[PDB]
Design a protein around this ligand. Structure first.
Ligand SMILES: Nc1nc(Cl)nc2c1ncn2Cc1cc(OCC(F)F)cc(-c2ccncc2)c1
Ligand SMILES: [Mg+2]
Ligand SMILES: [Zn+2]
Length: 338
């Protein structure tokens, strides 16, 4: 409530897509998530739904943000706040507003907040090759995604002052827990094409089929009944967390570039550590001594971003994201020059 002035000004236009996430990061002193979380959760009315106090939410936001590693270039608490900001923005669109229910909005906002908690600036494949404690613990299977979700529930329910779920119904919490886990596990890179194709086949193609019938009141109710089933909501939630997680190439160019630098530097570090130790190089192209960052972003956009956001856009209508996506793609091309 009683927030300082620069951070208050930094969080002024958080409903808008164009938002200065790095000014918030600078102003909050590597604590963007607690400030942005408090505003978002209050605006969506999350503690009113969960029956937590504002103090239990402050304690919760602090302990999870504390477990984000500041030393990570990209996977730090600013990424989580960025991913939280995009999640809120997608939940605020009419399509999602008239498809998802209140309990899904809470699962989405929480999942965004925790999805990368205690990330070690390293990929799953590094941990598996290295034989890390988590790779042995999770059996080389969604090693970090499992850990992010697990630790988040360990820190939440392990302390009474941090437990934002303590005043819930047994059945509401069990449903919410399942929804958070699913969305956090859905961010694993290996399941990308499985989750994009399920979204196209179960949502976009059936919805495009029903679009031929014309705008009718009976036809809208059939569209409403089909989309609002538990399965298709799970497919929409997975798509929403996936798009928010990698929404950086759809940002204003200044932010797009900054995100590319952070993620690249984090992969350059891993590749240096793989060479020094003699581990098998999983990302050979991402070495500081060989990598073109503009070319690597173009390739990244082609393989993952283009088809995924095209499908999400066709469902939600995100012209500003796709307009930024075109401008940023064209900027990366413009840096060749020879
Ligand atoms: N601008 C970005 N560039 C690159 Cl190179 N990786 C990024 C970026 N923003 C998030 N990531 C992380 C990420 C996510 C991802 O997929 C989203 C979901 F499927 F997990 C795939 C890769 C990735 C996979 C293989 N080679 C390179 C990068 C990296
Ligand atoms: Mg992750
Ligand atoms: Zn992430």
């Amino acid at each position: 409530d009683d927030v300082p002035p620069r951070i208050a000004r930094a969080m002024e236009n958080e409903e808008y897509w164009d938002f200065d996430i790095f000014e918030l990061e600078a102003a909050t002193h590597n604590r963007p998530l607690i400030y942005l979380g408090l505003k978002m959760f209050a605006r969506f009315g999350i503690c009113e739904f969960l029956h937590c106090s504002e103090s239990t939410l402050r304690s919760w936001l602090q302990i999870i943000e504390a477990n984000y590693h500041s030393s990570n270039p990209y996977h730090n608490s600013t990424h989580s706040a960025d991913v939280l900001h995009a999640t809120a923005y997608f939940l605020s669109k009419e399509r999602i507003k008239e498809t998802l229910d209140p309990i899904d909005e809470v699962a989405a906002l929480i999942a965004a907040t925790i999805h990368d908690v205690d990330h070690p600036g390293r990929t799953n494949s590094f941990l598996c090759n290295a034989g890390s404690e988590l790779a042995i613990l999770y059996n080389d299977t969604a090693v970090l995604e499992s850990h992010h979700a697990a630790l988040a529930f360990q820190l939440t329910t392990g302390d009474d002052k941090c437990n934002i779920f303590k005043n819930m119904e047994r059945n509401d919490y069990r449903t919410l827990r399942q929804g958070i886990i699913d969305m956090v596990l859905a961010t694993e890179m290996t399941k990308h094409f499985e989750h994009v194709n399920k979204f196209v086949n179960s949502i976009n193609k059936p919805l495009a089929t029903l679009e031929e019938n014309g705008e009718t009141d009976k036809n809208q109710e059939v569209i409403n009944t089909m989309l609002r089933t538990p399965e298709n909501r799970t497919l929409i939630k997975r798509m929403l967390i996936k798009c928010a997680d990698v929404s950086n190439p759809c940002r204003p160019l200044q932010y797009c570039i900054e995100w590319a630098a952070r993620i690249s530097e984090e992969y350059f570090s891993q590749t240096d550590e793989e060479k020094q130790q003699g581990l098998p190089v999983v990302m050979p192209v991402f070495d500081r001594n060989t990598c073109s960052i503009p070319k690597s972003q173009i390739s990244f956009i082609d393989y993952f971003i283009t088809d995924m956001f095209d499908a999400w856009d066709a469902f939600v209508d995100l012209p500003d994201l796709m307009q930024h996506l075109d401008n940023n793609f064209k900027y990366w091309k413009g840096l060749d020059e020879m």
